[PDB]
Amino acid sequence: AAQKSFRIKQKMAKAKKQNRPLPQWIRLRTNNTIRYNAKRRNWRRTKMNI
Amino acid sequence: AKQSLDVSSDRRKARKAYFTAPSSQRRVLLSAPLSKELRAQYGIKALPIRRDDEVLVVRGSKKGQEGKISSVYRLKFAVQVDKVTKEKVNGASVPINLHPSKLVITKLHLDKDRKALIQRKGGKLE
Amino acid sequence: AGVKAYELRTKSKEQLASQLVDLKKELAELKVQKLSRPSLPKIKTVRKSIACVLTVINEQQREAVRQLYKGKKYQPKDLRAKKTRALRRALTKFEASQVTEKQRKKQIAFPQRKYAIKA
Amino acid sequence: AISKNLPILKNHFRKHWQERVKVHFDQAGKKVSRRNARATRAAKIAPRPLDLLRPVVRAPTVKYNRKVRAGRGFTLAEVKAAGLTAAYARTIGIAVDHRRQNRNQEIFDANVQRLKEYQSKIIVFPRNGKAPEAEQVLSAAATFPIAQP
Amino acid sequence: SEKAGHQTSAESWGTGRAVARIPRVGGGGTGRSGQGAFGNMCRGGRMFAPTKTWRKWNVKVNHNEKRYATASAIAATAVASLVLARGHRVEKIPEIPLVVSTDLESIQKTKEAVAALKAVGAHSDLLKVLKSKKLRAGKGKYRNRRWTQRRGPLVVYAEDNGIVKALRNVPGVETANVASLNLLQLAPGAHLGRFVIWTEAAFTKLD
RNA sequence: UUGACCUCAAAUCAGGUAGGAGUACCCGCUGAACUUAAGCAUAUCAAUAAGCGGAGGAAAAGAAACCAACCGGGAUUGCCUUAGUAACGGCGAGUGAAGCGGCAAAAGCUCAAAUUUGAAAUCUGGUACCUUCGGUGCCCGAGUUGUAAUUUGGAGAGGGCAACUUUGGGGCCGUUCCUUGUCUAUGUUCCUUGGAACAGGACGUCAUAGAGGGUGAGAAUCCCGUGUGGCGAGGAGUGCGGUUCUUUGUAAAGUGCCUUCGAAGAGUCGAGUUGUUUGGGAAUGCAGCUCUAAGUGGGUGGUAAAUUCCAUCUAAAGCUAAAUAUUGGCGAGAGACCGAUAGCGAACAAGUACAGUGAUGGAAAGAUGAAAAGAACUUUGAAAAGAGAGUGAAAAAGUACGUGAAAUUGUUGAAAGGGAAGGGCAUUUGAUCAGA
RNA sequence: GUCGAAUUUGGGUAUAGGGGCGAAAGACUAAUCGAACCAUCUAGUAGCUGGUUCCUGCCGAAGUUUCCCUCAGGAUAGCAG
RNA sequence: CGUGGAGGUCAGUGACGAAGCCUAGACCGUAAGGUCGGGUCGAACGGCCUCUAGUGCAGAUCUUGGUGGUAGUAGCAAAUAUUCAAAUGAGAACUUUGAAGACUGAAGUGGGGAAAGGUUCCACGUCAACAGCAGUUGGACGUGGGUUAGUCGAUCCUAAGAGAUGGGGAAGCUCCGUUUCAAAGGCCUGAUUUUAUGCAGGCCACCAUCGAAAGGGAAUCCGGUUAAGAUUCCGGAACCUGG
RNA sequence: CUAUCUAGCGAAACCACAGCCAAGGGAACGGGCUUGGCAGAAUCAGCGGGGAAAGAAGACCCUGUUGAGCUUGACUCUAGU
RNA sequence: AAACUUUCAACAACGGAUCUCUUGGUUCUCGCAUCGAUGAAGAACGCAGCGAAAUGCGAUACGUAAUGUGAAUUGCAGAAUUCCGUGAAUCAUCGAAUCUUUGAACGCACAUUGCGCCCCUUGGUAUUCCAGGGGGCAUGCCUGUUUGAGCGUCAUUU
Numbered sequence A: 001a002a003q004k005s006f007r008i009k010q011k012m013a014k015a016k017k018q019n020r021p022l023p024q025w026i027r028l029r030t031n032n033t034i035r036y037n038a039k040r041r042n043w044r045r046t047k048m049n050i
Numbered sequence B: 001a002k003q004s005l006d007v008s009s010d011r012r013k014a015r016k017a018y019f020t021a022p023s024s025q026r027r028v029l030l031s032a033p034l035s036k037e038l039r040a041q042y043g044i045k046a047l048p049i050r051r052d053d054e055v056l057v058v059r060g061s062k063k064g065q066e067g068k069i070s071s072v073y074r075l076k077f078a079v080q081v082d083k084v085t086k087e088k089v090n091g092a093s094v095p096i097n098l099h100p101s102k103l104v105i106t107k108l109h110l111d112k113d114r115k116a117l118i119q120r121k122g123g124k125l126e
Numbered sequence C: 001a002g003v004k005a006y007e008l009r010t011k012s013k014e015q016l017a018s019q020l021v022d023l024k025k026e027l028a029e030l031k032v033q034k035l036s037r038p039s040l041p042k043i044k045t046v047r048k049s050i051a052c053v054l055t056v057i058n059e060q061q062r063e064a065v066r067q068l069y070k071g072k073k074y075q076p077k078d079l080r081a082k083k084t085r086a087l088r089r090a091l092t093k094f095e096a097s098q099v100t101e102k103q104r105k106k107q108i109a110f111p112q113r114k115y116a117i118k119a
Numbered sequence D: 001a002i003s004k005n006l007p008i009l010k011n012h013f014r015k016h017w018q019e020r021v022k023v024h025f026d027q028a029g030k031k032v033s034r035r036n037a038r039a040t041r042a043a044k045i046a047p048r049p050l051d052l053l054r055p056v057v058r059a060p061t062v063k064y065n066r067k068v069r070a071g072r073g074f075t076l077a078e079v080k081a082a083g084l085t086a087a088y089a090r091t092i093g094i095a096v097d098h099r100r101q102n103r104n105q106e107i108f109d110a111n112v113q114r115l116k117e118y119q120s121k122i123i124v125f126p127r128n129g130k131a132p133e134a135e136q137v138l139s140a141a142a143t144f145p146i147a148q149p
Numbered sequence E: 001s002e003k004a005g006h007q008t009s010a011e012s013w014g015t016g017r018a019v020a021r022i023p024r025v026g027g028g029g030t031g032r033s034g035q036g037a038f039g040n041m042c043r044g045g046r047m048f049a050p051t052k053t054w055r056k057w058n059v060k061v062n063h064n065e066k067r068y069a070t071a072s073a074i075a076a077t078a079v080a081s082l083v084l085a086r087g088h089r090v091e092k093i094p095e096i097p098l099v100v101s102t103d104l105e106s107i108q109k110t111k112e113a114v115a116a117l118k119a120v121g122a123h124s125d126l127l128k129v130l131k132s133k134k135l136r137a138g139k140g141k142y143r144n145r146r147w148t149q150r151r152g153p154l155v156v157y158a159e160d161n162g163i164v165k166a167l168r169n170v171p172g173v174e175t176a177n178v179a180s181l182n183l184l185q186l187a188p189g190a191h192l193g194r195f196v197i198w199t200e201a202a203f204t205k206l207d
Numbered sequence F: 001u002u003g004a005c006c007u008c009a010a011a012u013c014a015g016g017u018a019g020g021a022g023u024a025c026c027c028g029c030u031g032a033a034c035u036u037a038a039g040c041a042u043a044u045c046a047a048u049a050a051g052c053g054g055a056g057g058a059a060a061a062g063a064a065a066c067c068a069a070c071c072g073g074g075a076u077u078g079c080c081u082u083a084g085u086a087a088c089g090g091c092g093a094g095u096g097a098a099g100c101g102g103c104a105a106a107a108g109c110u111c112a113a114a115u116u117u118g119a120a121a122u123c124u125g126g127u128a129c130c131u132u133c134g135g136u137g138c139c140c141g142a143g144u145u146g147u148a149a150u151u152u153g154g155a156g157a158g159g160g161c162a163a164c165u166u167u168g169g170g171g172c173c174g175u176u177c178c179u180u181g182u183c184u185a186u187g188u189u190c191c192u193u194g195g196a197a198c199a200g201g202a203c204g205u206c207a208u209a210g211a212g213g214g215u216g217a218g219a220a221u222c223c224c225g226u227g228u229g230g231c232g233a234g235g236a237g238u239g240c241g242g243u244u245c246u247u248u249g250u251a252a253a254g255u256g257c258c259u260u261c262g263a264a265g266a267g268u269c270g271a272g273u274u275g276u277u278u279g280g281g282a283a284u285g286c287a288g289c290u291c292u293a294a295g296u297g298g299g300u301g302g303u304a305a306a307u308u309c310c311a312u313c314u315a316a317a318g319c320u321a322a323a324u325a326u327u328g329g330c331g332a333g334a335g336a337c338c339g340a341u342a343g344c345g346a347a348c349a350a351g352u353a354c355a356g357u358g359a360u361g362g363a364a365a366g367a368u369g370a371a372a373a374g375a376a377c378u379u380u381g382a383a384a385a386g387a388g389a390g391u392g393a394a395a396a397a398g399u400a401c402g403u404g405a406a407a408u409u410g411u412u413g414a415a416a417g418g419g420a421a422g423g424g425c426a427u428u429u430g431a432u433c434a435g436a
Numbered sequence G: 001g002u003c004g005a006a007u008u009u010g011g012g013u014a015u016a017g018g019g020g021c022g023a024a025a026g027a028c029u030a031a032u033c034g035a036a037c038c039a040u041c042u043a044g045u046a047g048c049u050g051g052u053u054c055c056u057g058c059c060g061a062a063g064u065u066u067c068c069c070u071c072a073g074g075a076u077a078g079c080a081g
Numbered sequence H: 001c002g003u004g005g006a007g008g009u010c011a012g013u014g015a016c017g018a019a020g021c022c023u024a025g026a027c028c029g030u031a032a033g034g035u036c037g038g039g040u041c042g043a044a045c046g047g048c049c050u051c052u053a054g055u056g057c058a059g060a061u062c063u064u065g066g067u068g069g070u071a072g073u074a075g076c077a078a079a080u081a082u083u084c085a086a087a088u089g090a091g092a093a094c095u096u097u098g099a100a101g102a103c104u105g106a107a108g109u110g111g112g113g114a115a116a117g118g119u120u121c122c123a124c125g126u127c128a129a130c131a132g133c134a135g136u137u138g139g140a141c142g143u144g145g146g147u148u149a150g151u152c153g154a155u156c157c158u159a160a161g162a163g164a165u166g167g168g169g170a171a172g173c174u175c176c177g178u179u180u181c182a183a184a185g186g187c188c189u190g191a192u193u194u195u196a197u198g199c200a201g202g203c204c205a206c207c208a209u210c211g212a213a214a215g216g217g218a219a220u221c222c223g224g225u226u227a228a229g230a231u232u233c234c235g236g237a238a239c240c241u242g243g
Numbered sequence I: 001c002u003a004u005c006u007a008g009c010g011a012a013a014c015c016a017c018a019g020c021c022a023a024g025g026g027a028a029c030g031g032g033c034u035u036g037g038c039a040g041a042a043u044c045a046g047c048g049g050g051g052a053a054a055g056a057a058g059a060c061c062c063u064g065u066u067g068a069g070c071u072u073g074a075c076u077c078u079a080g081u
Numbered sequence J: 001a002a003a004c005u006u007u008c009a010a011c012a013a014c015g016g017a018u019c020u021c022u023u024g025g026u027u028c029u030c031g032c033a034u035c036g037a038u039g040a041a042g043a044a045c046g047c048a049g050c051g052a053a054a055u056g057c058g059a060u061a062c063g064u065a066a067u068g069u070g071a072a073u074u075g076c077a078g079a080a081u082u083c084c085g086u087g088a089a090u091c092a093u094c095g096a097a098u099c100u101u102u103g104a105a106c107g108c109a110c111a112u113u114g115c116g117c118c119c120c121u122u123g124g125u126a127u128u129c130c131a132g133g134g135g136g137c138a139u140g141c142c143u144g145u146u147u148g149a150g151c152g153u154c155a156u157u158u
């Protein structure tokens, strides 16, 4: 809203920091059934609902 | 032929315990038998493999090949022996994972704790 | 190889405070270096050394306070035994072994005897 | 739903009966547990027959008064006539029942007699002596069986 | 599980929506929404007539009928043709029933117990096991039933002076007290003619 | 004016305690309707679901104001019975206990009401010291509107006589139990197949170990374990077995006879009425209101009442282990169970992604290979990729990865075809094929 | 149509399901209204509709009687194995 | 007849290839089915005697998943409109620049904000997916950068109202009530300064708290600066509050 | 501006199997059956006769010992008073 | 005759059935009893050389201390190979600590990372203003302490 509470900004900061693809050195680990970031969010597809 | 109520004959539990064994239990899981000469010299049959042990491959395609342990890759349930490798098509070399139950220890890497382990298992002359 | 708690334990609190200050300066300069140098794992050692020095300092302080409070009742609650809350609320051994004078007399007079059948 | 010539049934299953269905799968486990508990209780208590001496007693309700059976405990009168105090009998392994009363000299004499036999067939260990281990026998009821007069 | 298939708030959409009337998961957004529920025909639904623990598992049998069967199985162990028909390679073996010395009851070691069984001629029936061992066909093999094999001799004794432990490691071999003879051992698979090796004390205690 | 007392306050006074979670089982409150009655209202569902309060390892109950009617049993609880019975019920649908008997487990008790009155003998706290789950001294305080000792109905108490018998806790090491550590057998012998031997064959070994798992395919003997024993470590506790300092105590308890007594719970019992509830029926329990006891009394004795007996207990105060419960928690062992649309919703970063304002709703999704050896290098292409080369046992295993069905589809091959196609009987023709 | 007042509208706030709110249409109360949504009771009941999974062999019906708050159902007798 | 699992047996089959699958190839059975050959495949499985069941599908507007014909079909036609050249690029109707033609026409298709969103802002790289054509472009993808306040807001005040306490109700979750039937008080100071406190002089109380980024309200402007911040940064010049 | 044709992109409804008639009989209005008429690949734009076309387990009517909204000295109750 | 349509086969597709796997579920049995104001369960936000999650943890942040074992961890990097050692480890064990903001949640509030008060201390002349550091301030109830109130009330002076 550009006049946001610190709580909202903090959740926004966490979302920005976790908005990234899978680290590519994962998928080299020994067993590693993890293929991709299945929790990837985008502002155009799914709303954070705060 | 188990008698105690504290041991399980369940295949699922056994496999879970094996595959989720921590590093300290994997050390024991990865024991290797001594060679004939070392079995005579130490009076014991098998020992948990160590990184500087010298081993001879007795099973598999690498049977007869010898070398020194490069790594005890406990996470992979395998050991890597120097100069027992796979040459790739790009010129690189990669270690061959071997299971210690398919090797014989031909020369132990000794220290105070290894000697104490020998004597605790019933080893003669260190 | 980082600091060792058993070596720190032989040092006075002044030396430990000084070592903590030096370790903090070292960590600050190491995280300055990390901005240029990629993949600098040496900072983990200094972080663990700072943790170890703080651990030993707190050990010494808490031991001194335990000595201060030795023997007298009313120790500080974080120095008292942390059993469960119900276990700390439970009757002590002296209580729940308290018996009336009547009960003491009668159970002294007629305890459970040891007797076997022999035919 | 009244069909062909069949007896009228009274199956009471109109409540949520499946919420309370106790299948005794643990019958054998509970038997093993009862035997284990008996063994540890026998080992825990001093050499002592795992149960108190019970009196002989007539069942009520003429359907059953023709037979005799073990009662709860010996009456105060029976214990006194056997020469013990109730407290000491309770400590040396005799069940005492202050509620039961003696109106039958036959039963009274029988209970006094089995009390005397118990006293003559038990050895009480002194609290401060040696009393060498006396080969605990587990059943007082088997040792002093109730006989039908 | 008594709640399997019913951990949903599904309701039927009713008629008028061109779909079957089976109850359907409400809500939206997940793919499970709108799916059939609670039906034995429905994926993820509750099975028809869910199995219940109060099914009858053990079966009462008249004590006298059980003893009739045990006596019949004991008598069948003495018929060489029934023993041969029931596997039990007794061809070059002396008179059946096979009664051995009571010394067998006191053998402590598996080596000498196996030697005694071979000497009294159960060698072919011991070798039937150690050679019939095969992986079980089907899903029972990962339900702690991984291997199958034939039944060897049933050694029957009057007193256990070590024979039980000496023989418990020999595959296929079973040991029984003559006092308590198991029908499940005397007629395996409801097939009469178990190959039984009686000690002399057990044989005289049978009467 | 001073000093109390009583009652009531305040303090960030000294020290504590309660809340919330979990909630499978447990103790209560509150409380339906769907349903059944072929309708439906009493009834049933059900003294259940939902809601609320409160515990524990169990809870609750529990040592009779019981059951009985017997030749009497004797706390409670649980099982088998009683018994689908007595009884309840539009006596319809339905419902429905208890006594006895067999068994599991067993365990018994304590306050009030008593003048210590030649001695508040009792106790919290503070403080100093100590051997600190506490002790001693001292000092405030609590308390006579009653804290100790003594008694609990089975009794028991006050007096008189007679004697006899018995006894407390800490030490040290075992033992019991709990949590743990470690050691403890036998082939990697030969031949064949295979990428791999753990397969088949031969010759052996151990077996109180041929459970189970791993290792490049079905491994007792390669590894871990398994079996049997040995050797330790740290605790809990006095359950009990010994050794030793203690020595409790002319303290405490029990026992006989004689005598005088013998306190035993009140807006409670009980009664009326109302409501609910129960099998309890002129009223089973519970609760509200009104009435409201007694002391050779009172309660119960399953048909209301008067009268006369009898039997059996002793309420209106309290504690108590086990046998009993346990879709929760922690730790274990199993299965004629399911085998990825199954089995929990979830075998996987599943109560996740995602939907909804919200309460809530809630998926899909396992498998290269023994090992990445995950395709160096060449070539065409802007590239993706292709063609080669190569790795591999296999690329008819290339991460769009085990097998790889069907629907549906491409190509090739064959055949037929004037407004369906498919089918039956029979034979021609073409293709194809077994049998002697 | 109306367009300067019974005006339009933001935000804050209050009213909650047999309840609200209604210049009243049973209107509106989050695409839901002649009783919202969510979960549970609940797999509610259905004399009614649909479906009900291998082969062969032998035998083989009834739609009629009486009674029923019965007339799309049941009991009963009959027919059948 | 067939299926999953179970006891027994055939010392059954099997990495020299189990199961599965495909096969207008063969055989047996009236049939349910059974057997064999060939191909594919890779680790188990079967005959018989019995045991057992979550045991046989064409349908249920059946459930889940997958796939068709329809069909390269319906269609991708509101908001006046595009064109030329160059550059870039493998590729340009759509990108960039220039030129032209137009439109919004200040009640804007302009410049800012509130709610909401949450990084979409900006730069660099970059086109597998997405932008229902395309794409070298993008609100996409990948990696980073970026939001600077005594003066602008919140913060403070009270509004409709919400809501502890004291009390009362309710079995209870909780409800009522908001100054009420309450012993609800701190801020001042002569003295005390054994210490600016306690005793001890004296003055004022019908009362928590929450509730507005549009109401009320202390105080900042201009110029410049960034890829992206500006009444916030820089330069200069002020002001208010507390001390 | 579509429709149309092209490059690119690319759904859905619906679908037992399908698709030429006349009469017959037939569940009394056939695409199939009988008897006749006939009948020649593959198609494009239109079209609205037919497919008793599609959309929806008819909302009217009846039945059910299925409800619900509403009313009333229906039966039985109940807050309040 | 092609094309087209249909049928079958082979190869290739589509799709993910079948088969075989199984660190999962489910049911049965056995044993045990241990959450929280000494701050629980739950939540938010952070923490790694390179992590988005899961898991672990709390500014001592995939952990510190202690003990045991005895040489690893591993995807890369780095370190180390003294590793015959108070010593590797994403090991086990776990008794000492740390434990952000919260939460029954406790100074008052909370759609605010809002606003006080007390004590010690540090800096700015500074008891008073501002700031930094440390330690505190919820409610009900109980025992006790201290200070009090009431002609409720006793005694004494009077």
Ligand SMILES: [K+]
Binding pocket: G034, I068, I069
């Ligand atoms: K209605």
Ligand SMILES: [Mg+2]
Binding pocket: none
């Ligand atoms: Mg949008």
Ligand SMILES: [Mg+2]
Binding pocket: E004, E005, E044, E045, E046, E047
């Ligand atoms: Mg299921």
Ligand SMILES: [Mg+2]
Binding pocket: E138
């Ligand atoms: Mg199979």
Ligand SMILES: [Mg+2]
Binding pocket: F013
């Ligand atoms: Mg205090």
Ligand SMILES: [Mg+2]
Binding pocket: F035, G044
């Ligand atoms: Mg029901």
Ligand SMILES: [Mg+2]
Binding pocket: F037
């Ligand atoms: Mg009904």
Ligand SMILES: [Mg+2]
Binding pocket: F038
């Ligand atoms: Mg009905």
Ligand SMILES: [Mg+2]
Binding pocket: none
């Ligand atoms: Mg009805």
Ligand SMILES: [Mg+2]
Binding pocket: none
């Ligand atoms: Mg409930």
Ligand SMILES: [Mg+2]
Binding pocket: none
């Ligand atoms: Mg507890």
Ligand SMILES: [Mg+2]
Binding pocket: none
């Ligand atoms: Mg118990």
Ligand SMILES: [Mg+2]
Binding pocket: none
């Ligand atoms: Mg209790």
Ligand SMILES: [Mg+2]
Binding pocket: none
């Ligand atoms: Mg009593």
Ligand SMILES: [Mg+2]
Binding pocket: none
């Ligand atoms: Mg009783």
Ligand SMILES: [Mg+2]
Binding pocket: none
């Ligand atoms: Mg009967």
